[PDB]
Structure formats: C-alpha cells, structure tokens
Amino acid sequence: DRGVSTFSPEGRLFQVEYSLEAIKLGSTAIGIATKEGVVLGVEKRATSPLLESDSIEKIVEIDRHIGCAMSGLTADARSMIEHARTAAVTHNLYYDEDINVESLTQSVCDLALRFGELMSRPFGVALLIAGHDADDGYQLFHAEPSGTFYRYNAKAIGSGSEGAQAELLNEWHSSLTLKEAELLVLKILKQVMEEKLDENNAQLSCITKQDGFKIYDNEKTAELIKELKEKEAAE
Amino acid sequence: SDPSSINGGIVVAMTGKDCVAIACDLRLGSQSLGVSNKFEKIFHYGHVFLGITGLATDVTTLNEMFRYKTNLYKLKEERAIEPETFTQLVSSSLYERRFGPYFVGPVVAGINSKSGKPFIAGFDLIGCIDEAKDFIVSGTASDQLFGMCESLYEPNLEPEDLFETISQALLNAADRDALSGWGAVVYIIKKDEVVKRYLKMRQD
Amino acid sequence: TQQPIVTGTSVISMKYDNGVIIAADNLGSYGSLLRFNGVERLIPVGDNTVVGISGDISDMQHIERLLKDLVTENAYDNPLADAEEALEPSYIFEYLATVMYQRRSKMNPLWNAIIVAGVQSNGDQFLRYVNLLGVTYSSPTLATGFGAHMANPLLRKVVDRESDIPKTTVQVAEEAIVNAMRVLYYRDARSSRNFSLAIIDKNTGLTFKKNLQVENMKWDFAKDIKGYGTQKI
C-alpha cells in the first residue's frame, strides 16, 4: 500500500490531514475565554430519541483547574483524557502545586505523532483544553492530532466550525463577562446545530479561579436558553 | 529443616519367579506429629508401578506430572509405557530440576508386557538410576530396609512366598523408624493380574 | 566488588605562583612483595594536564586507556583540537569523577585514588582529587595514601592558605615535593627510591622528569643505636 508516516508532495502527513477530515464530521464544540472565566459548550447529537442523552460525555474534567471538550472520533479521546489526568496528578505529586494549562496541553500533544510501523494511526479527535493558572490566568487551547496547539480568545471545532469561528470573530471583545460568554456559546451552537437547541441536546461548562471546573446542570442551562430567547426578541 | 525427613515414609520393591512386589507405609506427618494414615506412596500408570518417598508435596506433584506424561505417551505411541522406558522418563524429569530438585526417592516396579521379564529400579533426587536384580529400598528407614532385605531375600521366590518376605521386610523396618508405619500396603504383580493387600501393624 | 592485587602508593602535589607540581614513585607492589620497579603512575593528557593514580594498577591501566581514548575522541570533527577546543584539566577530571562515582554505585569500583594536576586556558592552577568512592575535594596541597598523613603536613608549611600561592616560587615548591618523597621513602614500607615528577607551568608549559632518586638521606646516626634499652655493645 504505502507508509503510515508518509509525506505528501506538498509536505503534509497524509494520515494527519485525513484525521482532520474525521474531526470535521464530529459534533460542534465551542470555547470562549474571558477575564471572569472560560466557557466550554458542545452539541450532544444523539443518533436516536431512545438514547439517554445525559450519558453522552463530550465535556470532561482533567483537574480542578482544567476542563476539556472534544469533537471527532470521541472513543479515541478516552486514552488522551487518561494521560492528561495522570500528567496533572503526577505533576502535583512531584511539585506540590497545580500544573500550568500550557504544560498539560503540551503533554497531551506529545502523544499526537507517536504513530508508525507506538499506536497504528493518529487520533481522530480534536480537544478544546480550558483552564486557569496563577502565571497566565484564564486560557483556552486547541489540541490537534498533528501535535500542534494554539491558544485562542475563542474557538469552535467540528461540523459547524468555520461558520461559528466567523461569528466569534465579530462577537468577542476583551471586556466580555462570564454571563455574556455563556449566552454567546448558546447563541452560536443554536445557529450551527441541525436539531433545535434545548438543555438535553446541548451542554455548557466553565472554569473559574474560585469554583474550578463545573459541568452545568440541565436546569441551569435551560434558564440561560430562556434568557437568550428573550434578549434576541428584545430587538 | 531437612526436606526429605519432614513427612517421613518408606517404599521397598522385590523381584520373584515371573513376578515383582512393591510395598509402602501409610504415614504422613509434620515431623513428630502424625497427620494422616491414608497417604499411599505407590501409584500405577498402566502396568508400571511407581513408589515415591520424601517431601509429600513433591510425591503428589510428581504423581500428577508422570500421569500427565504417560497419558500423552499412550495417545502418541498407541501403547502403554513399559518399566524400562518409564525408568528413563523419571530420570530425565528429575535431572531437569538438577539445581532445584524434587526432594523424593522414587522406585519403579513392573513386568515388561512383551518379554515377561520382572523389572525394578530406584533413583536419587536428581534422577540417578539404581537397577538392582534383587531389591530396591527408599525413605527414612532405608538403612533398616537394607538390613531386612539383605538377610530375608532369596532369588526366584513364588508370588505367595515373595509376599511374606517383602511384608516382613517393611513391617520390621518401619517399627524401628519414628517417622514410618501407621499401616502398610503390598502389591504382588504378575504378568496379567495384580493383588493389593493392607497389612495389620502396630499404630504407634 | 573486588580486592586490589598489584598496587601503587602515595601521589603528592601542590600549587605554586605560576602552576602546579605532582609526583609519584615507580613501584607496583604485590602485597609485601615489591614486584614491579618500572611502573609510571603519572599519565600526561595533552600539554596542560597530568593525572597521578594510586591503588590497583590493572584499574590504573584501564583509566590510562580511557584518557588515551578521550584525546582521540576530542580530535574527531574538531578543527580547534590543538587550540580553543583542546581538553582542559577541569574536563578530564569531571569525566573521571563521573566514571569513579558510577562504578562505586554499581558496587564494582575502580580501586584507585586519583589527583588531576594542570593549568586552565585562562592560566588558573587546577588541582582536584577523586577516589574509588567518587569523593572529590580541592586544596592548595593534595596527597593520597601515606602522602595524606606525612606529605600534606610538610607541603602545608609552604602553602597553608590560598594567599600563600602567589608568594610560592617553583624552586621552593619543587624543593618541598622532593623532600616529602624522601620522608615517604624513610617511613612508607610500600615506597621505592625511584620516582617521577611533573611541573605544569602557565609560562614554560609541561616539564616531565623521569628516573628521579631520593638523595641526601640521613642514616649515619644508626651506628650509635645498640639494643632496645639496656644493651651497651
């Protein structure tokens, strides 16, 4: 056939570029960073109404100060999350402190290109890693299967990404409140989602210095959806 | 401390006219304490009889091991293993544990099914073969058994005579050993019949 | 873990104003037997370093080969091998110190005490000690075995502190070393009269002296000593 670690004539790794296509088919995930915290939102996208949606876990805790949202082949993410949690705890054991969000992201991205003929193929999933540390405050990172990561003020991944990113381009400013950011994630999710957005097919989460990483209750998210509908009807 | 005298026990084998006899005591102990009087030390794989003295865990382990090996032999060869061949298998098996040996004193007895020739053999724990014409002894009262056998034994004894000789050899040797006795079994082996007798003996 | 078989005794050394001196006798002992009388225990590395070795001679010959191999390896793809990227005394020492501590930590030591004497690029005097345990230390005067007990006291009367090094000439320093070697010949039952001495000067470079002998010895007073107390004849 051909090598798994082969370069294309354009100087790109075939298998990495192909995995990026798998991520485009994934359900939407959005992150927005503010001075009051970082918000993480996902489309659950249940395949059938008999599927108990609350069992769909696409937002995941890594440590008290680091959350994570995923998009693509979500099964591939389990070992990446496992490694991230081990890295976060192991660093706390060795240094009696919280691990920097950038260091944790860098650790996850070191797995990415460990494939050849190590694992048989790249990961088919992208991660939004949100957290806080004392040095660089509130941070949002995009971890790809290429092993590259970018820091973002705001970022969307999955099927509705390029539509969502164009919306985040206009809406984001440096003075955004946490409440404003929550509504903004819900607004853009509702725009790119196939089915109508409710508290059962979408999930919110945030990371604040005080309370750490929290996945929002369906009752809490429902109230923010109702608050959104009213403020859009207000003009 | 000495593995070969923790549990105690004895085996003796003898040849006669167109027959062999193998006999053992029934004691198993933790040194001074007697635990069981049903611990038979003679096993048979087809028409080949194996007696084992020494550490009881190894007696049981080797019985299970030789049953395993003789079963596979029979399936592949499509015939029962003979005494001469089994003797070589015991020796092979013991010497492969040369630097971590089974603490046992094995004794093989049986009649070659084709030639009809009576056969006995003894081994040390690392699998050296003693192939005597007359008799083989093993266990904590080996000195006593050597004494009894060397005086009592004469060649070409009839099956029913050989029985009395081997029985008196075991019984009187066991009564001069603290770690032997608590009953005894005697196998009289002819070409195509085998009689097994339990002996009355003092239980102290 | 082993025992030393063929062994070398004291290596002694000190700093002076412009460089360092090091010395060692030419004996390889086999217990109480003075077996080898032609053994060189000062091994020069380039023109700026001398390594003095006491203890097991088989282990010394191994270390000799490591240093020979170190010079070869340094030259590989190195246009400045005989200039700015030449082996420094400090580089040679740290390598040996690394090996000595690694070997002790595998419970298979190189059964030696080593003194690296030399002058650095900037003209600074280098003198540091390492032994089979990987223990290291520097001092204006250094000595192994019996040297530590008998040589150091004599050398420390010349250079007691750092401030005494500029005030110490090469003539005074060599005189002290040569006297110390005589004292060791008087009093060490594993020493020989024949020794080698090496001077590493920042101006005049490396001077290596072979087939030196202990001379100007005092024995005449022996004739006047009779018995162990009461004997008069």
């Binding site: 056939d1 090598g3 003929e117 | 299970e64 091991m65 049953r67 395993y68 079963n71 596979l72 399936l75 | -």
Partner: protein, 244 residues
C-alpha cells in the same frame, strides 16, 4: 520495505467478512465428508478417506478420527497437518486441566480453548488461519454425550447430528429427515453409513474408504469406552447394515 508483499490475512471485506476464513471454508468443502450423530446411549463418528489407493496401508493409517483423551475424540475435515498441530494443543490442555483439578476436562471447555486459538489467527499475528473443521464427540458427567463443531473462524456450536467437509448441504438434509431424539447407537451407526453411502462422490462405499468410531456407555457398568473400528470391523458393520 516488506509491507509490499503482505497479504493482510486479518482484515474485513467491505461486506464485513474475513477473506481468509471464507477461503479456508471453501478449502474444507472439498475435504472428505465427516458425520457425527449423538444418541441417548452413545455417539457415532463416521468419515470418508479421500480417493485412496490399493497400496495404502489402511490398518496403520489415520487421517480423519483422532483421540484427544479417553472421553473425547475428533473427526477432521481440511488440512491433516494443520489438524495435528491443533490436536496436540488440545491433548496438552486436557492433561493440564486433569493435573490442576484432578478431574477429566469437560467437553465444552476443551472445545472453547481450541476455538479461541483459531479466533486469534483471524484477529492478530498476520498469519493464515488453520484450514480445519472439527467434529468433537465427547462425554462428561455434567452434560453427558455431546457433539460440537469448530471452523477456521473460531466459532463453535452444539449438535444432535452434524456433517463437515464435502456435500454437507445434502448430508444435513438426509440427517434432518431420519434423525429422532429417542434414537440408539446401533440405529445411529446405520444412519451415518446410509448418509455417506448417498452423499459420496465415489462409485460405491467400501471398508477401505471409511474411518469409523463409537463412544459408548457400552462399557462394563458406569464408565465410557472409545472404539476406533479396525478395517475388518468396518467391513463387518457394512455387511450387517446391508450396504455391501
């Protein structure tokens, strides 16, 4: 490098089939027919040797029926050499179980292990599967008399009567017609031979072209006997049932 020459023996087709397993089954369909019939009082194993010669020593020959222990036998359909590799593995597992638990291995446990080995060759290692289908005839004191089959996929199933190898479609139809639950060994012997006699690609069914075996409680009292029929004994049962 070496990737160029790799057949990739352990991949799915677009239809979700294992190429090598399917092709191995095609191989087995050309092998001599083997039949197992389970009765109330025993089991029959009948099997057809493939186009023999007059100069083949039959009395010392074995290609179809093999002994695994005193309680379990197998009929082979496929590569004889591949079968013997698996048979020796099964014989060892049986003795391992006996050594560990001091009890004869239950039939299913032995069957499952051999089937699990075959499965492995389809999921990892990049080696070709074993081109072998087994009929297991066995007795234990849990389920009594048992018939199983395993194929190169590593799938195994239990049977009252089954065929493997050539003309199984035809053989299975004839067995499904004449088999009843209250059937006895003597009747099952007659059914097995009558089935082979009709499905055979040969002109006539003779003693020199058959291997035959029974597992009977027809052993003096409460025990089980394996009988691998001799050439003269196969000739006698062919006259008795009235095929020659």
């Amino acid at each position: 490098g070496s990737r160029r020459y790799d057949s990739r023996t352990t991949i799915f087709s677009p239809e979700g089939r294992l190429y090598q397993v399917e092709y191995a089954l095609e191989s087995i369909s050309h092998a001599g027919t083997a039949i197992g019939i389970m009765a109330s009082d025993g089991i029959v194993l009948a099997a057809e040797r493939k186009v023999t010669s007059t100069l083949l020593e039959q009395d010392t020959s074995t290609e179809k029926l093999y002994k695994l222990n005193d309680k379990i036998a197998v009929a082979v359909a496929g590569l004889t050499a591949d079968a013997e590799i698996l048979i020796n593995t099964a014989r060892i597992h049986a003795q391992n179980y006996l050594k560990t638990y001091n009890e004869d291995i239950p039939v299913e446990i032995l069957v499952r292990r051999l089937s699990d080995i075959k499965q492995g060759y389809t999921q990892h290692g990049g080696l070709r599967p074993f081109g072998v289908s087994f009929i297991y005839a066995g007795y234990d004191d849990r389920y009594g008399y048992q018939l199983y089959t395993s194929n190169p996929s590593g799938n195994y199933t239990g049977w009252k009567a089954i065929s493997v190898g050539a003309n199984t479609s035809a053989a299975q139809t004839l067995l499904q017609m004449d088999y009843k639950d209250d059937m006895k060994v003597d009747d099952a012997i007659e059914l097995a031979l009558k089935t082979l006699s009709k499905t055979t690609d040969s002109s006539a069914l003779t003693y020199d072209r058959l291997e035959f075996a029974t597992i009977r409680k027809g052993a003096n009292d409460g025990e089980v006997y394996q009988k691998i029929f001799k050439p003269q004994e196969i000739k006698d049962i062919l006259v008795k049932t009235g095929i020659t």
